[model samples]
Target: AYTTFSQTKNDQLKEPMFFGQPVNVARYDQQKYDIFEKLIEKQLSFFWRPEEVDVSRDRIDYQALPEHEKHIFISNLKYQTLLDSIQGRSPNVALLPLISIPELETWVETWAFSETIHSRSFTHIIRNIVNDPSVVFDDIVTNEQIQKRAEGISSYYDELIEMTSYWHLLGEGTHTVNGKTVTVSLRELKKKLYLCLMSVNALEAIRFYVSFACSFAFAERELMEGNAKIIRLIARDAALHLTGTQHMLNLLRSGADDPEMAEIAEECKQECYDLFVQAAQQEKDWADYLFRDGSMIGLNKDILCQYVEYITNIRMQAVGLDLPFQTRSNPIPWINTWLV
Candidate 1:
């Protein structure tokens, strides 16, 4: 299949960004960074399956809910599917070939494989609670609100994919490919990869965590216990995935990945900052949509918006961006219990 792990790619420790060389094997013996190996071990240790969780009680729980509660539950589910749908596909399509080290390469794929499982978990949740699974899955693509955010997440990935396709096929130089001038400069390509990683950091750091607050909010009520259990496990996995993305971003910014990438990070500092702000704004709008009908017992558009700002600020600072939001305690104090 995808050669999810390799054991014999020795010189990968020295490979540069895209076009260095193909990863010949996957090995974990001595990684360029030990974090990937640690992440892999952490992921394997948290192993779980959807079938192991019981959401059967949820079928009755959901059906008994009022219209507004149903809206809260279903809307959260749709948002989650949207997150995973992009995640399940983005890494392999965007990062795999650019990676030269075998351990890093496998980590990219293994990280992606975990997202596929999360996507499948949503389908299972939908199939169990809703009468027609197709309706829920289909709405994810066609829904206006979700489609808007999908553009934000997928566009960077799509652009990177396009540039990568040309770079790999033509190599770094102006070439007449199909009568079009294809200029692939190593400098420009590295910048593209840097921007892509920044975009992904915005995604994991901002978008998915905002959604998690909603998932855990429902769990806070002691309702949807089954879905909450599954999401809690997913949260544990997501924390690791977030850490992985941050590690990549950190290494590149610090020149540990490459001195050139560190320079690129310096040059693109403002652009990266704007990306985090942009994601936070989108999430603020999303909170409005989630709570548009009516406020729940604990969450509302305003507080969720505040949480978005709060989380956005914390995440941005972790990657060297200035915190954009005023510091405040978590607006919803009770939700803190679900995290542990």
Candidate 2:
């Protein structure tokens, strides 16, 4: 049984952000991590409504496109729809139960709330461009290529959530579950949390950026500029989202929150490296899928694959993890203009 107000009444300033006393007071006068509070403020300030952008021209532009080009455009949008759909719900489900600070709790809520708008934004674009949006929305789940990618993306969150539920229920010990011994170690759970954060870092840092390159590619050619405008706003928030995860990771690794978590970060270094590599490969595979029909004017399988590697190294290195790929410049420097 969890209480909305943890009764300890401990010094909120001294408590760790997670696994500490649950915040009883709703007051936000002070924060243990000012950065999170700032993130909430900044995110709130960046508020946008999907209706503000006019995609009227995009519908005409989309209808004029050839079959292959339409395939690339719709496929990219579908993949993005999948990512935001997961993100819109996953963060609150997997993270809120573990959050222990008022500021961070609110930040997680804020982050997830922003993603909901992103999901809505996809509907906005889809409804405008296609007569039957269901044709595009329904394919997100049934499509084999996207379903494959969803497995890896959802696995970490699913595992962490399962273990977390057990930890709260069983209180961290070896017990009989279905006549089998189940060990729930706080350390193991922390390791999962570390790895999960790393996976999320790769998602926002690499995967989303790769999708952004495709979205902006059309705008680079003066097609779908309105869609690009909406994406630009999304990218700005994504950059903040990327920075939030990086800070959480670096903070955990530096032992600023919990010293034990620092050891877990070291122990899981190789696994984290492997995680990044796996995501990069998945994105590269997705790139291959996007271009299977045919390549676009400014984007292709090979160049998008390179961009994945390049962004992967940068993201991994930011968290002090080892980079598996060679250092290289951005393959699509033009996309930065659209990224904000």
Candidate 3:
């Protein structure tokens, strides 16, 4: 038999984000945190699979394409593969140790697992359209464009993971291990976790959306139908992932669950802004390259750069960041049709 205890303290709802209760009973009926429940609902509704789309025609479509168009197609696919690859594992490695509540803990794992599916979807697309899947997959790491983004994406996770290992293994103190003094502090680890999530928000909100613009750009003029179809599936998943992240950011910001985390949110604000600005600039650079040889009918470097700023403004505002840039209309309005 389970015992019901309440009012032992000010109540869980008034507690801090972490160092709070272990979320005694998984009840959204009364939440110290409701964002996870909302995120789970949104994610469940967007479920899809790669096998649903027929990309066999894409092979014939690719064969007839001009050389630069193939470059645009192949390069976007490679960058996408890298994006999902980092997402596939980063959450599990970074968030699992820090989580206390059962619902939010499970949600993080589920979110990362879904991204793995996105990674596999890229492989499926590669196998369908390219004769040599290995060549393109291998290029992702070596390619200068995608590699530049990978460092910014992975560094925070790596730092957080290392610190978490020390905190969990040795507890919070200076431990002299193997003639090396290793100091672990719970306060420091929590800071890392907070910033890591901010970094993740930048990844999902800015980086993946940049790729989405490219994928939907191809579909804008009714080209690369099969690739665009696969991207649509990826986009739906990305939308869920974005919702999960924004919920986390907003929850921490409001101090609804964790009061201290509200402070952490304030402290990390500038760094998070830097992350968004860096991604926007990187994406604009990528756009320049994608149209280097020739511009597509409805899309070009200037318009894509404009879309980057437009999306940056909208996404930044969603999580309480002040919109520093001027807002512009969607340069590629046709892409909206594919999203639906």
- Clashes (backbone N, CA, C under 3 Å), per candidate, total 4, 0, 2
- Each candidate's lDDT (Cα)? 0.80, 0.88, 0.76
Ranking by lDDT, best first?
2, 1, 3
Compare candidates 1 and 2 on lDDT and give the better one: 2
Writing each residue's lDDT as its tens digit, candidate 3 over 1-340 gives 1113222334545545554443354455555567776666666676667766778787887778888888877887788899889889889878765665656866787788888888877887788888899899888878886776556678889998888778767878999999999999877787788878877877787777777877776677567787788788777777778877888888888877666788878888887788788878888888766777887766678877888898888888999888867877877777687666
Task: Give a tens-digit lDDT track for model 1, residues 51-117.
Answer: 7788988888789877887887788789889888889989999998688766677778888988898
Better by TM-score, candidate 3 or 1: 1
Better model by TM-score: candidate 2 vs candidate 3: 2
The sequence of per-residue lDDT tens digits that candidate 2 reaches over residues 1-340 is 4567787767878877677666787668998788998999999999999887899899999999988889999999999999999999998998888888888889899999999999889999999999999999899989999877656888999999999989889988899999999999998998888898888988889889988988988999899977898999999899889889998888888888889988988888999989898888888888767888899766898888899889888988899977889889988888878875
TM-score of each: 0.94, 0.98, 0.88
Clashing pairs in 2: none
Location of the lowest summed lDDT over 10 successive residues in candidate 1:
1-10
Residue 51 lDDT (model 3):
67
Those runs of model 2 whose alpha carbons end farther than 4 Å from true positions after fitting are none
